[PDB]
């Protein structure tokens, strides 16, 4: 039963995301390259997928890693220590494809003699959903803004809804992504 709702941590604020949605980095729709990172590398940032998770908690884990990175950067003199991260709640539709399922389909076709995802990561990927090319702003319901002052340790959480959100009865695609 594919999720009707997924979540995405992003550093981009709602003035950007609620107007533009999320857009992928390039036109490379190779699922294995997205999941392993080949299509996310500097000099190689061309994936056609926008990642989301059906687990809000997992997006909070992502946010909290980035928060700690900002705290550590300030301690080292490479940042202000003022971190802002955002968790977006997104309506999934047939343009959203399960990562684990898409991986298994990729392997069934091309094998794994070379590119192989470890079991621990693949288990996380059961909750990862890949939106092809973009997530329109009409799919984005609301945002949670998390501010953290690295120097004082103080945090706030604030909520805003997206006026452009369009309600529809959709859920993620039940099938793997195929190129
Ligand atoms: C590290 N950058 C080159 C790429 C990047 O920032 N990716 C990115 C950026 C934001 C992301 N946000 C998520 O919620 C998420 C959830 C599951 C898997 C990945 C993500 C996610 C990934």
UniProtKB/Swiss-Prot annotation:
Q: Does the keyword Nucleus apply?
A: no
* Keyword Signal on entry: yes
Effect annotated for changing residue 54 to G: Very low amount of final toxin secreted; approximately 50% of wild-type toxin level accumulate in the periplasm despite near wild-type levels of mature size S1 in the periplasm
Q: Which residues form the active site?
A: 34, 128
Q: Where in the cell is it found?
A: Secreted
Q: Which family does it belong to?
A: Belongs to the bacterial exotoxin subunit A family.
The induction field says: Activated by the two-component regulatory system BvgS/BvgA.
* Name of this protein: Pertussis toxin subunit 1
Its Gene Ontology cellular component terms are: extracellular region
Identify the EC number(s): 2.4.2.-
What is the species listed in this Swiss-Prot or TrEMBL entry? Bordetella pertussis (strain Tohama I / ATCC BAA-589 / NCTC 13251)
């Amino acid at each position: 039963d594919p999720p009707a709702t997924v979540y995405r941590y992003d550093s981009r604020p709602p003035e950007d995301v609620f107007q533009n949605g999320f857009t992928a980095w390039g036109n490379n729709d190779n699922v294995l390259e997205h999941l392993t990172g080949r299509s996310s590398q500097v000099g190689s940032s061309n994936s056609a997928f926008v990642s989301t998770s059906s687990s809000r908690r997992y997006t909070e884990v992502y946010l909290e890693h980035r928060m700690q990175e900002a705290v550590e950067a300030e301690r080292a003199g490479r940042g202000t220590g003022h971190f802002i991260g955002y968790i977006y709640e997104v309506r999934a539709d047939n343009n959203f494809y399960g990562a684990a399922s898409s991986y298994f389909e990729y392997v069934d076709t091309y094998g794994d003699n070379a590119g192989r995802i470890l079991a621990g990561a693949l288990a996380t990927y059961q909750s990862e959903y890949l939106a092809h090319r973009r997530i329109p702003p009409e799919n984005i319901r609301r945002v949670t803004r998390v501010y953290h002052n690295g120097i004082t340790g103080e945090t706030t959480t604030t909520e805003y809804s997206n006026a452009r959100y369009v309600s529809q009865q959709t859920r993620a695609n039940p099938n793997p992504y195929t190129s």
